[PDB]
Design a protein around this nucleic acid. Sequence first.
RNA 1: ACCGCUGAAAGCAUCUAAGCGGGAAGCCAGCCCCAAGAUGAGUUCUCCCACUGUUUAUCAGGUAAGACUCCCGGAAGACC
RNA 2: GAUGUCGGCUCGUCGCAUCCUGGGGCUGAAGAAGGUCCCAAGGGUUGGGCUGUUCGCCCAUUAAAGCGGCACGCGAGCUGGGUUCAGAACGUCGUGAGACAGUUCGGUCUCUAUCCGCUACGGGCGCAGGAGAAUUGAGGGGAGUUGCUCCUAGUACGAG
RNA 3: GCGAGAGCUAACUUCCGUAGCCGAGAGGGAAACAACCCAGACCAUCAGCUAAGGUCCCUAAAUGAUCGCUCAGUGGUUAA
Lengths: 37, 171, 205, 142
Amino acid sequence: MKVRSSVKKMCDNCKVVRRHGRVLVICSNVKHKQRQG
Amino acid sequence: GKQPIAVPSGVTVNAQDGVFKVKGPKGELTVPYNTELTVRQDGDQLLVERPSDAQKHRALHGLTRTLVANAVKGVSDGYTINLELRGVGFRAKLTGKALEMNIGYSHPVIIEPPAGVTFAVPEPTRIDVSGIDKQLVGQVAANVRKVRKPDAYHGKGVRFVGEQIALKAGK
Amino acid sequence: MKGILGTKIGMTQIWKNDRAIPVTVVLAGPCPIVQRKTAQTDGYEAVQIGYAPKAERKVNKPMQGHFAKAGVAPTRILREFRGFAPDGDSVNVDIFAEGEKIDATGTSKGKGTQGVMKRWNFAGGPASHGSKKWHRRPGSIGQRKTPGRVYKGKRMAGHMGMERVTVQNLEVVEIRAGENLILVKGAIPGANGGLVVLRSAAKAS
Amino acid sequence: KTYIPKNDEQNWVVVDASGVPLGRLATLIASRIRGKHRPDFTPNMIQGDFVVVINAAQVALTGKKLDDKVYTRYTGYQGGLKTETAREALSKHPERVIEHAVFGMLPKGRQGRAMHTRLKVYAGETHPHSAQKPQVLKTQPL
RNA sequence: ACCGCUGAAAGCAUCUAAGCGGGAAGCCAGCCCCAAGAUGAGUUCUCCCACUGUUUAUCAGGUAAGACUCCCGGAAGACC
RNA sequence: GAUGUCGGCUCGUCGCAUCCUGGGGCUGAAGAAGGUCCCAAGGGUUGGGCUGUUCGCCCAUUAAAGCGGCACGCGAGCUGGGUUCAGAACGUCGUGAGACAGUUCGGUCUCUAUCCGCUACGGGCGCAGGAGAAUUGAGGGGAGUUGCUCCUAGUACGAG
RNA sequence: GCGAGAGCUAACUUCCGUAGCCGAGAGGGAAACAACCCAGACCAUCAGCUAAGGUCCCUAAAUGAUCGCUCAGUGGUUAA
């Protein structure tokens, strides 16, 4: 999991989602797994 | 936006109040919704209409329909998911209705189906969770798919037959 | 739950097979039943047993009635036990069984007013390299202009002992009914002649 | 020259807390207690009727009854005596959720305290009516 | 934290905005000890019971149940 | 018309930007062992040698051998090794008296606690009779650690 | 506060210019509080209108009216 302040796409997958007051990043690949929190 | 509504024979809706009550051949099922969420049957088919249209609304909208349409194929055809046990010595037996895992753990894993679910096993290497409520089934085949996820090097443990599990591949 | 009153009596040596074991000989005399509390009278379920006897010439008038209210015979000690019952009077026969683990609960021998080295261990200090705070005396009570006081609970001298205590899970080694005698492994609280209460494991392994 | 006091009065009202927004309700309770449309309407001492609340357990909040509403409570020398609970967490004692949100909207002085005395909540309903043998003018909120 | 079921708004997809579940030496309960001066001062069992004193001595005074005083002790304790 | 100074010792308690134990994502993660980011402060965090030390280096261990705060926590609590009195010495500066980035041996650290606070223990009164005794539990406190061996299994895994 | 030097366009920092206030200023407001905001106390009065500020309850006064904005507790501690 990657908690980064600046969260953005990293390939034509990265699906920026919004679960409980948080900005997430689900990509078909994992190393792209992001999350401001 | 969603509107079509196949309400085949077996059914029996009862929009009485907010408890959009239902009854079919598989067993009377009940699903609540939003009151200001406008819906009932017109002519033959059915439809859930809506007041305002943009978000706070068109969402519950696209929710309810999908939801009721479920109770349909619900009491109409009943639901059943098919799981796959995979890996060396992985195997499920049973006990009454109790799903019985056997997946590498120093001691066996027993799983018990809740109030309206049923376990079945063909070859102690394939599984099945049938039932009435589309949710629970999913909401439980999960609990079974969880007793052991597939690994990134051999994709073992329970999975979804036509499951796509590529392998990292190590040494 | 279950339980009965008793008197400590002393410890001694005893071999169970080839392993000598120290044991605290307790006497849990037969106990009377002088009042059944029920979550319908006292709002809660429980029992009142009695212990040592007492001459009626000592027995207050009111106390007589309470005991007479069950026709028992003035004891001199009464104690409650939650969620218990039986019919008649409570003895250890059948109650505790050889092998059961129990929680003996007497009253610690009273140590009077004790320092910190003794009541809380502390460490006092020196004994030779400069002093006036030889061994005992606590070091410092706090910090400075912050928490310009001392905390609530700081350990300091005080009356040590004379407190209720409970030493859990004791193995009832032997049991001599016909003598309301019982033998427990290990040491029970308080001194001989003291009232000890033996119950079932408060919560055991 | 201004008016004086009375006494031989003790209006015994019974407000209902059901579904109503705790706060609002509270303010109301806190109102009458201290002095509503007031008799001699005076400071010195209280003439503010006696309040009986039923239910309580079914009072009402909004976004937070899990989040935000955290009734804190710091015991002994605060050697980490930081004890707090979610309001929903006050399902053990709804009774206090109210009772302890009103003693706030009430003077805090000598008299002030003697004023929680007249507030008298009950987590129930009809059963509560038992601890109720005097008047009972049910003056619900609004 | 993290993993999820059913799933719209974006006819797909989504742990989610309706909803539902799993989940930490931590939190609350649980264990042992204190505890109604919890002045909102609780509960239960038992005992003693309704004395005397004329607007001149308006309330105290015999007493019940019970207890203190005091004596002799104590595994209780500085004194209490 | 005085807020005692470095370091120890004693006594603790708090934050988390967690040192170890707990849970988790990703790993270039086979397993075992690790890296790293997230959540998480319940509790725990060893004994020696050198130095006044803090620090740090080192011996032997450990699950670990956290970092900081509280007048660089704590002298009406102890020490007094350190350094900012009087003696004396060396080097150095000064014609000198004296001086010092310095170094070195020596050198009285004040029985009596009033208010708050704190630990124990009593007396009063109160709790709508006067008494004996048995309790409910509002609330509050204490405790909350970790290794190793065995078993499963020489399995899963792995060319081994 | 405004205009500059200094200083890290740091400090209840420092030095000038300039206006106001405290100093020599009570009263209302700003929870509390020199100088910020309103306003300058001759004494007496259970009389009245207003400023800055305010009008759920702790306090005096519309939980006011109408059209909107945000579900964060933003409101009730900063930024790329």
